[PDB]
Write an enzyme that holds these catalytic residues in place. Structure first.
Site, mmCIF file in Angstrom:
data_model
loop_
_atom_site.group_PDB
_atom_site.id
_atom_site.type_symbol
_atom_site.label_atom_id
_atom_site.label_comp_id
_atom_site.label_asym_id
_atom_site.label_seq_id
_atom_site.Cartn_x
_atom_site.Cartn_y
_atom_site.Cartn_z
ATOM 1 N N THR A 16 0.803 -1.227 0.000
ATOM 2 C CA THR A 16 0.000 0.000 0.000
ATOM 3 C C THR A 16 0.836 1.278 0.000
ATOM 4 O O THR A 16 0.259 2.373 -0.112
ATOM 5 C CB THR A 16 -0.942 0.028 1.206
ATOM 6 O OG1 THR A 16 -0.186 -0.264 2.392
ATOM 7 C CG2 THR A 16 -2.064 -1.002 1.016
ATOM 8 N N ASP A 39 7.765 -10.096 -28.397
ATOM 9 C CA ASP A 39 8.891 -9.187 -28.213
ATOM 10 C C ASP A 39 10.074 -9.648 -29.063
ATOM 11 O O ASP A 39 9.869 -10.155 -30.170
ATOM 12 C CB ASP A 39 9.192 -9.086 -26.694
ATOM 13 C CG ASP A 39 9.792 -7.776 -26.302
ATOM 14 O OD1 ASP A 39 10.949 -7.504 -26.670
ATOM 15 O OD2 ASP A 39 9.106 -6.973 -25.620
ATOM 16 N N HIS A 69 15.756 -7.091 -24.753
ATOM 17 C CA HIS A 69 14.501 -6.488 -24.321
ATOM 18 C C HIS A 69 13.440 -7.543 -23.983
ATOM 19 O O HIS A 69 12.800 -7.476 -22.922
ATOM 20 C CB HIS A 69 14.060 -5.545 -25.436
ATOM 21 C CG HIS A 69 12.823 -4.751 -25.150
ATOM 22 N ND1 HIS A 69 11.560 -5.221 -25.446
ATOM 23 C CD2 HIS A 69 12.656 -3.499 -24.648
ATOM 24 C CE1 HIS A 69 10.666 -4.292 -25.141
ATOM 25 N NE2 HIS A 69 11.298 -3.243 -24.641
ATOM 26 N N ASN A 161 6.359 5.682 -24.689
ATOM 27 C CA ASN A 161 7.375 6.445 -23.966
ATOM 28 C C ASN A 161 7.551 7.857 -24.517
ATOM 29 O O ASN A 161 8.661 8.390 -24.527
ATOM 30 C CB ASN A 161 8.707 5.717 -23.964
ATOM 31 C CG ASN A 161 8.599 4.317 -23.432
ATOM 32 O OD1 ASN A 161 7.867 4.032 -22.475
ATOM 33 N ND2 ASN A 161 9.332 3.402 -24.071
ATOM 34 N N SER A 224 7.596 -0.377 -21.379
ATOM 35 C CA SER A 224 7.889 -1.787 -21.642
ATOM 36 C C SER A 224 8.139 -2.583 -20.376
ATOM 37 O O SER A 224 7.988 -3.805 -20.398
ATOM 38 C CB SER A 224 9.134 -1.914 -22.529
ATOM 39 O OG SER A 224 8.886 -1.603 -23.865
#
Length: 277
Positions: A16, A39, A69, A161, A224
């Site tokens: 939290t 990907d 990636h 992005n 990503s």
């Protein structure tokens, strides 16, 4: 279960509050679910995957992740140390080349591949697809993501992005999938994260430690990196029986930490993925 000294993003999704470092989760850990990572591939021999990762499709001369990636994103979904759902099955679909690039026609083919290929796999608890990719608006790309979701796969996609409204990017702008923005360790919207009404949720995306190629690890940033946190969370929650592929995005939004993030533009949700464990 508790994992001490976890990456901050894992600790964040079971907390939290920001600023803690232990990840708490039910030991079922996504067992019996499957997550497709669409990907650059996955270095499936990485010790962190423990034999639970495999390549199921490539559109290139090899299925090897020559970039990193895809391996990084797969690690956030499901690696033993860096992953949300530490017992899920990971399936790699290489739609991006080793420079991280892919044509939209190949990306579409990969999405339709997953919608069919799940019928060749054993995923009694449900199926997720994680799409840490995107480009400019394309109705065909959005429609492919919509079909994948309609087929019974929880589709999680990166918002992008560009520090811009995600309505101009695909598959981010598809309404029926789960569009994921990025946050940082201080509960700020990540400086690069796209925003807008099409976002459904935020996940940890700045300075995310995960697996890399050559049996290594590294910390990188992006929407990503946020997307696989939400994909892994969906798999985890489906294994617990709390939600289904068709409803997991809504369930994650309903159970999210609300109102915790800063620099959220007016009209963007202030919801941070949370496992409520």
């Amino acid at each position: 279960a508790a994992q001490t000294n976890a990456p901050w993003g894992l600790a964040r999704i079971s907390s939290t509050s920001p600023g803690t470092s232990t990840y708490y989760y039910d030991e079922s850990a996504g067992q019996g679910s499957c997550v497709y990572v669409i990907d650059t591939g996955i270095e499936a021999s990485h010790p962190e995957f423990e034999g639970r990762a495999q390549m199921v499709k490539t559109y290139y001369y090899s299925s090897r992740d020559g970039n990193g990636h895809g391996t990084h994103c797969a690690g956030t979904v499901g690696s033993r140390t860096y992953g949300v759902a530490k017992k899920t099955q990971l399936f790699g679909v290489k739609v991006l080349d080793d420079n991280g690039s892919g044509q939209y026609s190949t990306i579409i083919a990969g999405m339709d591949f997953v919608a069919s290929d799940k019928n060749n796999r054993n995923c009694p608890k449900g199926v997720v697809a994680s799409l840490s990719l995107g480009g400019g608006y394309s109705s065909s790309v959005n429609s492919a993501a919509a079909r994948l979701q309609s087929s019974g796969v929880m589709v999680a996609v990166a918002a992008g992005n560009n520090n811009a409204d995600a309505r101009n990017y695909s598959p981010a702008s598809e309404p029926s999938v789960c569009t994921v923005g990025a946050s940082d360790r201080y509960d700020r919207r990540s400086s690069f994260s796209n925003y807008g009404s099409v976002l459904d949720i935020f996940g940890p995306g700045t300075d995310i430690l995960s697996t890399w190629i050559g049996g290594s690890t590294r910390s990188i940033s992006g929407t990503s990196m946020a997307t696989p946190h939400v994909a892994g969370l969906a798999a985890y929650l489906m294994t617990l029986g709390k939600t289904t592929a068709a409803s997991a995005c809504r369930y994650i939004a309903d159970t999210a930490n609300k109102g915790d993030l800063s620099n959220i533009p007016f009209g963007t949700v202030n919801l941070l993925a949370y496992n409520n464990y």
